[PDB]
């Protein structure tokens, strides 16, 4: 075959930006949706919390065989990585959040003054856009940031930043897609109907008093005269005790509240928006008939868990490849070609279903496997960890026999 | 007014610069770039040949009775002149859908000043600085 | 002696920068509505030359 | 790589005077949050329920290898966990009070204090609406500016970002050191409700 | 940074305005007056005004 | 500045295409004055649309006064010899 | 039915100055080169 | 159908105030006159508990919100589309009666698998 | 029947505004007169909370959405098509009352197998 | 003894505050007879309120006959340069 | 034009208010606050005396052939006068780079209205309200 890509990739721009598939203005538009708050922002925050809020675990295949003296004390690569990234649960939630809002999460590697590794430091994603070659790979990062009354702009090489893409146009898409911009029309439709409802509730949601003065086909009443009537019937001064006395030629009519189904409009908006963002309708505080139980429920929660799994896999691989491996290679005594995996926890596990499973089929699982499913530390003794019958069952025999 | 590029004829963008846009009703059919004047209550019609009839220039082709966007004074406009003109010439509605110079007209004062000269039957660029009405 | 400050938005002085992208100018504008009134002018004495 | 960040952080503003900056928040914006907190009704109770959910159930201190820390502190053995539980006796109340204030305001903020002998006293909190940070061009907080009411006007003072500490729950970005008030983020929704 | 300087000038200019409004009310509308008649100015005038 | 009605912008407007298609489908002749308003003719530049009745489906549809064979509504440009 | 949602390009001029000369990214709008 | 619904909701989903001025068969009201009436009844500065005082020859009518079942149209569109793409209906956040349980549920899930 | 429903939804699924102009048995209104009225009530430039001020001789009528049970028509079409193809009704995303459980379900699934 | 309407009590009455605020937002000019009932002028001492039309929002809102640009309803005291 | 504060002289900011600021080529060297008129296609030069030659005032010093910004006839400006002026005086270019009154000029109409009075050689404040071109 070949050692260089030979299909072209639809991406090398005519201008003197690298095509700017999104411009800095679009990135500020995403930031403006995010900072505006309300129902839209909360839905996209629920999306981040589902995908990344349940935290993480680091695995290495043959981790025990990595045992090495790091600083007199022995460590495995997993132990070293867990010390290199102490707060990875927060970082995964932060980067995973950004990589759903924006086309990418992006950042620097950082060092102590002594030149030991400090952190992977995220950078504000709306401030940065990538510039990329004829085979679609990012070669430079162009950064525009606010300053008093204007902007500062700089360019940095792809050599020393890192970036992660969750949503892609193609498997070759190294730049990614914003789910906000992908669904901007549904966001606009939601927000405009929200404003339309609010204004209609003020005008039409409450009855209004209409006093008509004078006899029909009788003497005309002028503005001067209505001012005196207005003083008598003024709502600002009226109460539940108030009664009125009049001649026959004064009529107190009412503009009724003119009913319209704003609840149905909200539910339609929320259905359109939640479905567009791939969330179940229930996330929007809206219910539905024939969808709350049985296989109709189980499908939508399966579709949700599949979407979460797909995003998690996409994020995990890129974090290991673009962040962890360079850090192992450049600041660690261990082999960077070791088989590192980052798992991210399933947000929707029922521990009671796991416990039921363990009761039913634990007789076919090692005590290590049971500890993994149960989310506990594996046993200290490798023999009891490796064995299939319970550690409590081995203890009662080892003591009792 | 129109520009030629190969086979193609392109309409010119009438309004170069300007903050002063207002909507009126067409008193007759009008075409983009025509000078116009008040002909009834908020009603606008084509300017006649001399002074006293100018509110702005029409920005798009309309049938009679349609809403009309005008570019007013404070606007820079691409307009056809019926006369050869030079920078600093004051110009005035010609009565023919074009402008002409004040010097050619019977009037003493213009409505727009030429910033970029043009031949007869050709597009100048001009700044509209005044309106003219019935003074008697 | 009361310094009465008024703002339609917030409470204090309202100072804003804005950009004109037609002219490439930053404007910086400040506004405030203020009045000052005694509740008891008897509670003050001036010293006069 | 580098020992300082080379990416910039989007966040200049103000100086001594007020600015409608958007990245910064003024003492007025902070006292608006104070007013939503103390004016009561359904809005206040919902945000109090939010604080009680996040921080009301109390806390536990853990140290990995705590037994290995066994040391004579004052003629008596302790572990680090035992020492910390003596250093912070009522951490559950502090967690609820700071955690609540960090949901209301952009941050909780406070001092470290010493006994006269110089031993640790407490992590005394500070009233968050009284204080705002000053931050550099690369993103760190460098000083804290404090405004506090006195008898129809104000005192004002500045403190280094050294002997104070601060905590941010809600952030504009993963690189944000100043944070967002969920109240001011949703001010329009709160006024829509009240109207 | 000219924008920081201009924010400072605008803020100063508003504060100067407040101070003018304040001092003009204060001086014009005081209901008591110690006339020193060019004599015993300083502490005695200040005590007399009190 | 360019408005939606401004002459240089008309080809970008989705409505300008859609209503010119509508006019072609709806005419019986090239004679616009007898068929369209001055508003329609100006707004959609109907002089420049190839209007002639040849794209109106009703040009080709049988519309017989007495229809024994239930054959009205048949379109001749769908016959096998077309 | 849907439109031809396309636009044909006009004439495009040749752009070379940025390659065909020494480009200075100046710090100031006005300046000097010493000779 | 999504576009048609969205446009119809704006035009028809909300009531609109229709003030009629003058007596039937009486004196005509001109455009200038209606501008002053508009100034009194303008929704932009009206509020929820504004009250009106008039002579007998001003009528505050209402264009009601004209009801139509856009929910049924959305469900129908979703039913057509999901079945055309071979998905179960529930993937569209739309439910159906009787289909939610028993052998009817077993079948649609067997077809999907 | 699918084509018929889809066309009927466009014509009849949504209400349409009908402005009637001029007094009944009064002065006639010509097309060039209606063009100016169309400019006011234009649904293109109208918004959700637009308000109208008129004399007594302008009426904003409505073509209501004229109800028809297209859901029942789709269900009947699907009932025909599925049975003609020998599929169970549930394959069409339809289903039926009293048929989802017990010996009625056992029978239809036996026939299918 | 003092009643709500009594001259020494008016500044205690919430309604005297609220209604003077209303009166300032209603007016277009200082001419009270043109705008207010003679009851209101006495009851709320509208001679002493700084009524002049400068506080009425309608003084500042644009309301042109024809609006092609959505200019109507903007308030000039909310522009950038105000 | 310059302002003194203690030992120091400062440049006067020409523009007080307005947004009608427009770009031309300088036909000669020009100085801040100087009145100018169209000398060629989008080219402006210093106004002569007695009318027919005014488009606006030059906002900053420029050499010949440089692009120049100009305050037009909606702007409010600080400008130097050759004679004493008072509020409500109409003024127009001197030919000397300053302004004088319509009262002293041979012209009959001005281009700016004086809002704050000034002595000869001082800076007045004026509102520019018209432009003047070639009428013949
Ligand atoms: K002539
Ligand atoms: K002279
Ligand atoms: Mg009578
Ligand atoms: Mg006294
Ligand atoms: Mg030099
Ligand atoms: Mg009559
Ligand atoms: Mg008749
Ligand atoms: Mg101005
Ligand atoms: Mg301009
Ligand atoms: Mg002007």
Author numbering:
A (entry chain PK): 31 to 45, 49 to 434
B (entry chain JK), K (entry chain JI): 2 to 137
C (entry chain JA): 348 to 396
D (entry chain PJ): 31 to 225
E (entry chain JA): 199 to 248
F (entry chain P6), J (entry chain P5): 1 to 82
G (entry chain KF): 115 to 149
H (entry chain PL), I (entry chain PA): 226 to 338
Paper text:
Here, we present the near-atomic resolution structure of Haloferax tailed virus 1 (HFTV1), an archaeal virus thriving in extreme salinity. Through single-particle analysis, we obtained near-atomic resolution maps of DNA-filled and empty virions, enabling us to assemble full atomic models of the virus pre- and post-DNA release, including all structural protein components. The full atomic structure revealed that the virus has a length of 1350 Å and an icosahedral head with a diameter of ~600 Å. The tail has a length of 560 Å and terminates into a baseplate with three radiating TFs of ~190 Å in length.
The portal is a dodecamer of gp13 (PP), which spans the capsid through one pentagonal vertex. We found that the symmetry mismatch between the MCP pentamer and the PP dodecamer is interfaced by the intermediary portal interface protein gp21 (PIP). A pentameric ring of gp21 (portal interface protein, PIP, brown) integrates the portal 12-mer into the fivefold vertex of the capsid. Around the portal, the conformation of MCP is again different from those found in the trimers, to accommodate the capsid-portal interface. At the portal-capsid interface, one of the MCP-bound magnesium ions is replaced by an arginine of PIP. In addition, PIP also has a putative phosphohistidine residue at position 17, which forms a stabilising H-bond with neighboring MCP monomer.
